[PDB]
Amino acid sequence: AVDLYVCLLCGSGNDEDRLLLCDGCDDSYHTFCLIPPLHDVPKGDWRCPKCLAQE
Numbered sequence: 001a002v003d004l005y006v007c008l009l010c011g012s013g014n015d016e017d018r019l020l021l022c023d024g025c026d027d028s029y030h031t032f033c034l035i036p037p038l039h040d041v042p043k044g045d046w047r048c049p050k051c052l053a054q055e
């Protein structure tokens with residue numbers, strides 16, 4: 001894992017450019033490999049559903 005952040009769903013490393021970090025919980029995923037969003041990163045910090053339940 002040369003890249004400081006990798007996608008747990010894939011962990012390619014190149015996709016790190018669009019890898020989104022979850023502030024609600026330590027979870028990283030690509031905008032096109034987990035959430036509807038795609039090449040364009042969504043505004044605000046996206047959080048996986050489990051974190052939403054905490055709030």
Ligand SMILES: [Zn+2]
Nearest residue numbers: 007010030033
């Ligand atoms: Zn991914």
Ligand SMILES: [Zn+2]
Nearest residue numbers: 022025048051
């Ligand atoms: Zn999360």
